[PDB]
Amino acid sequence: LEKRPRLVGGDIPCSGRVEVKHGDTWGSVCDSDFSLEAASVLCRELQCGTVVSILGGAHFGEGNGQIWTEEFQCEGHESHLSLCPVAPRPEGTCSHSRDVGVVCSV
């Protein structure tokens, strides 16, 4: 399950707050750290098609625990977030009020 995505707090299927498994935590992702490329990989990986909207600012609620401290530097084509290049991030630059969300289609 490591670096697998889920979407939680969404009203309809294939939408919600982004959470990506990191050890024993389903970690949220700061909107600032996210990208259309990573959102594309997430929608693909979740069998949810393509990105329609990226919503920042904890639109679908706030996560809890460790916010991701690596950035998913996806090229955009990858089948899995686990296959994207990553970069280390400094801790504490975002709160959960910036947890990113995605709406996928198909």
Numbering used by the authors: 1 to 4, 478 to 578, 1001
What's in the article?
Infection by its etiological agent, PRRS virus (PRRSV), shows a highly restricted tropism of host cells and has been demonstrated to be mediated by an essential scavenger receptor (SR) CD163. CD163 fifth SR cysteine-rich domain (SRCR5) is further proven to play a crucial role during viral infection. In the current study, we prepared recombinant monkey CD163 (moCD163) SRCR5 and human CD163-like homolog (hCD163L1) SRCR8, and determined their crystal structures. After comparison with the previously reported crystal structure of porcine CD163 (pCD163) SRCR5, these structures showed almost identical structural folds but significantly different surface electrostatic potentials.
MoCD163 SRCR5 was comprised of two antiparallel β-sheets (β1-4, β7 and β5-6) and three helices (a single α-helix α2 and two 310-helices α1, α3), whereas hCD163L1 SRCR8 contained two antiparallel β-sheets (β1-4, β7 and β5-6) and two helices (a single α-helix α1 and a 310-helix α2). The minor differences between moCD163 SRCR5 and pCD163 SRCR5 were only observed in the long loop regions.
